[PDB]
């Protein structure tokens, strides 16, 4: 009785915090799309339906999105699969050559500038002894002038190699379900209001994460998951300024984006069994790519976020916005992909307002680059193939990424500027509800029973 | 429409209950512990790390007196300096998480004590079957 005996218990429901790898699983309709044109189907295992997600009660668990892992190895894995999607593809080492470029056939404005150049150059053939003369079109933002006459070259060709993407593979997202191996569990904060740090009483475990589509957007995170009822703002330390501010706003707001130009491609055989695609002729009106959003929706959503900001910055506070300060071309804008072709599209028509403590649209112009260095690699670049026709796409704008300015010296206006920088902000806007825990069985406890012999 | 007893009997469902009622399920936790061009390497070391963990725990039970019983006893009394809690309150008051954070310092003493106690039990049983 009073001689209490210690007894073990194997399989005690209990866990600790840990960090481990994951399990990449999608649906079988990605495998319906055949011949590996979808990336993440070589390694990505097919999912299961009706995944177990059961509630847990009388439970207090502290979460953190900022000291969270699994955004780190996800940022590893996506660039890893990105490089796995290039080793079958083709190099452009024979292409870096002297370019005889000139202005495209257009009524030219002497003061504005056209953004398409007609470049003729020597190129190899199927056979070695035969050289050929071929022309194509390029944007202004990928050639530079070398030195009378005019001769250009590609910008990467002094400093890096270059790889064409295979036109089989697409760049649309598919939902990636992350899962944990046996011996680990994944938790989820089911609370309505959760700024991102501290306890969450409403939690539930899960076996596999929900649908996550991988986007690439330097500002203005697109097609993401949206909040329940309020507009929520999240940060690590709001009084710190250089740390960003994530803004998950409730209602989605539509965007149209297009390039109105009709586009012909042209195959160019580089060598034996090689291929290359280039912008041939442009039929129709030489126009400029752009995007549109609805005026009053943008006004109302900004009213909601200004309503939500003033809890943190004093109730009698003036809040205004500015365009982003500068830096790289792909952080002065938001930078996205549409139909497998990139856009760097000016955002100064949005963040130019002010707010007081009391059928139209918004159009904004874009630019189109072909060669990129996304994630800013050291000698690695990527060509993007020209695609046919006239491209438009419609996306639900989900969140924002902001930065408070360094406002000292007696200021009541606390203006904001949108700046993304790291992609891990975009990713941390998605896995903020989750964390990974390790099961440790074989707990132990006294009770009143002695083993006989 | 699904019933609440099923998600009580689900995996890690009884994490919030008292430990006396959480005793009524261990097999689901035990079962979900086990199993249920470059990437298969990571897959494969995850799987063998899981089974390495499982074999470590099975060996820790195997050197102890109980192998498949999943509910055991022994012959070392509970030191009241470890807990000084009432016997009634521990089974109907606390959860396993806070029990773990209470007894988490008193670790690797009890392990070696179980090893020593049943080693002595092994030599006693050998002596009793040797005299017979």
């Amino acid at each position: 009785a009073e001689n209490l005996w210690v007894t073990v218990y194997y399989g005690v429901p209990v866990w600790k915090d840990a960090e481990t790898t994951l399990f990449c699983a999608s649906d079988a309709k990605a495998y319906e799309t055949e011949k590996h044109n979808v990336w993440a189907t070589h390694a990505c295992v097919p999912t299961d339906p009706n995944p177990q997600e059961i509630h847990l009660e009388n439970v207090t668990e502290e979460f953190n999105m900022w000291k969270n892992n699994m955004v780190e190895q996800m940022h590893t894995d996506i660039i890893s699969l990105w490089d796995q999607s290039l080793k079958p593809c083709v190099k452009l080492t024979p292409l870096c050559v002297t370019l005889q470029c000139t202005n495209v056939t257009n009524n030219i404005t002497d003061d504005m500038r056209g953004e398409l150049k007609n470049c003729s150059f020597n190129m190899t053939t199927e056979l070695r002894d035969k050289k050929q003369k071929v022309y194509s079109l390029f944007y202004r933002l990928d050639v530079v002038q070398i030195n009378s006459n005019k001769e250009y070259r590609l910008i990467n060709c002094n400093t890096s190699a270059i790889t064409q993407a295979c036109p089989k593979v697409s760049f649309e997202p598919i939902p990636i379900h992350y899962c944990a191996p046996a011996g680990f569990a994944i938790l989820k904060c089911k609370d309505k209001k959760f700024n991102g740090t501290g306890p969450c009483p409403s939690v539930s475990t899960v076996q596999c994460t929900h649908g996550i589509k991988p986007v690439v957007s330097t500002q203005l995170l697109l097609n993401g998951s949206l909040a329940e009822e309020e507009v929520m703002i999240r940060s690590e330390n709001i009084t710190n300024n250089a740390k960003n501010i994530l803004v998950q706003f409730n209602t989605p707001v539509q965007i149209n984006c297009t390039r109105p130009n009709n586009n012909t491609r042209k195959s160019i055989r580089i060598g034996p069994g090689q291929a290359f695609y280039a912008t041939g002729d442009i039929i129709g009106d030489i126009r400029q790519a752009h995007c549109n959003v609805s005026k009053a929706t943008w006004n109302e959503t900004l009213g909601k976020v200004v309503k939500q900001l003033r809890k943190h910055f004093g109730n009698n506070t003036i809040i205004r916005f500015a365009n982003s300060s500068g830096g790289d071309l792909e952080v002065t804008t938001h930078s996205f992909n549409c139909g497998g072709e990139f856009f760097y599209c000016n955002t100064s028509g949005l963040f130019n307002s002010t707010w007081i403590s009391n059928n139209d649209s918004i159009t904004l112009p874009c630019r189109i680059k072909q060669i990129i260095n996304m994630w800013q690699r050291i000698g690695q670049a990527m060509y993007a193939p020209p695609i046919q026709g006239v491209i438009r796409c419609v996306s639900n704008i989900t969140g924002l990424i902001l930065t408070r300015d360094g406002g000292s010296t007696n200021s009541t206006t606390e203006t904001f500027r949108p700046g993304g920088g790291d992609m891990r902000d975009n990713w941390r806007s998605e896995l903020y509800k989750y964390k990974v825990v390790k099961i440790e069985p074989l707990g132990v406890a006294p009770t009143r029973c002695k083993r006989r012999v | 429409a699904v019933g609440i007893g099923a998600v009580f009997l689900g995996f890690l469902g009884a994490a919030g209950s008292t430990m006396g009622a959480a005793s009524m399920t261990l097999t689901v936790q035990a079962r979900n512990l086990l199993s249920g061009t470059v990437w298969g390497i990571k897959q494969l070391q995850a799987r063998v790390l899981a089974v390495e963990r499982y074999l470590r725990d099975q060996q820790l039970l195997g050197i102890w007196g109980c192998s498949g019983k999943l509910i055991c006893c022994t012959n070392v009394p509970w030191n009241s300096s470890w807990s000084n809690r009432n016997l009634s309150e521990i089974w109907d008051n606390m959860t396993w998480l806070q029990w773990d954070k209470e007894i988490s310092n008193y670790t690797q003493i009890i392990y070696g004590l179980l090893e020593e106690s049943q080693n002595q039990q092994e030599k006693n049983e050998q002596d009793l079957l040797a005299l017979d």
Partner: antibody, heavy 116, light 113 residues
Framework: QVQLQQSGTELVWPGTSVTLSCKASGYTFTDYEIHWVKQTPVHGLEWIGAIVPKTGYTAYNQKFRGKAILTADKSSSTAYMDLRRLTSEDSAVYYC???????????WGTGTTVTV | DFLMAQTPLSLPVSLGDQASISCRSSQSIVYSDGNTYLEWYLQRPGQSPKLLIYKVSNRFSGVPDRFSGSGSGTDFTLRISRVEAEDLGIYYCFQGSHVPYTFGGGTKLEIKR
């Protein structure tokens, strides 16, 4: 016969506490899971919580967290819902109802209006 | 959490005509046993909610074959072959697959002239 004999209609003050009863009638109490359904005119129906009759295992909606407390009597076969520190939104119709696991609600009680 | 958007939220329709309610979930509310535990209720104004449809293809024991249900994954459809004065009340799509359970908005059945 098979009926959820509920409590009486309660007309209470703000901030008080009250207990709503639900006697199982005509069947085996100790196996059929008891649920509680809030009925306001503004929201319609809401899930309050649930209690296992045999073990007393409860689970509550996040809205009702600390607002409602479920007990059960195996002797009198009667579920009890303690409602504490009442506000005017508690002025509603509370339905006692029962199921078995992986099945539906068959029996529906009277529906007790509690007006704060 | 697994919320239910019930369209419509009130059904005025004459007697003898069919009825169709599309209740759409946020995502898959299927439990691990494969069954999509959606339930449809009828609370008359002044009476308790009598169950119409559980286990969407199935019907309540006693509720006639006029009633029926279909729908999967997200998009769910209560169907009635003919609307009666006995059918009147409020209809409910109800996620019965996980705790916390969620009700829909309800659909007040009435008569349109």
């Amino acid at each position: 016969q098979v009926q959820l004999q509920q409590s009486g209609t309660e007309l209470v003050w703000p901030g008080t506490s009250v207990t709503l009863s639900c006697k199982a009638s005509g069947y085996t109490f100790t196996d059929y899971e008891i649920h509680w359904v809030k009925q306001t005119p503004v929201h319609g129906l809401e899930w309050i919580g649930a209690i296992v009759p045999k073990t007393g295992y409860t689970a509550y909606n996040q809205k009702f967290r600390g607002k409602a407390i479920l007990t059960a009597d195996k002797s009198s076969s009667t579920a009890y819902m303690d409602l504490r520190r009442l506000t005017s939104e508690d002025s509603a119709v509370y339905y006692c109802t029962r199921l078995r696991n992986y099945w539906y609600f068959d029996v529906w009680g009277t529906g007790t209006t509690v007006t704060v | 959490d697994f919320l239910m958007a019930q369209t419509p939220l009130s059904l005025p329709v004459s007697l003898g005509d069919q009825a169709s309610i599309s209740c759409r979930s946020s995502q898959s509310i299927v439990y691990s046993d494969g069954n999509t535990y959606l339930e449809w209720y009828l609370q008359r104004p002044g009476q308790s909610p009598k169950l119409l449809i559980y286990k969407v293809s199935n019907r309540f024991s006693g509720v006639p074959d006029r009633f029926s249900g279909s729908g999967s994954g997200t998009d769910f459809t209560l169907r009635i072959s003919r609307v009666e004065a006995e059918d009147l009340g409020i209809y409910y799509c109800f996620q019965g697959s996980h705790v916390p359970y969620t009700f829909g908005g309800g659909t007040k059945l009435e008569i349109k002239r």
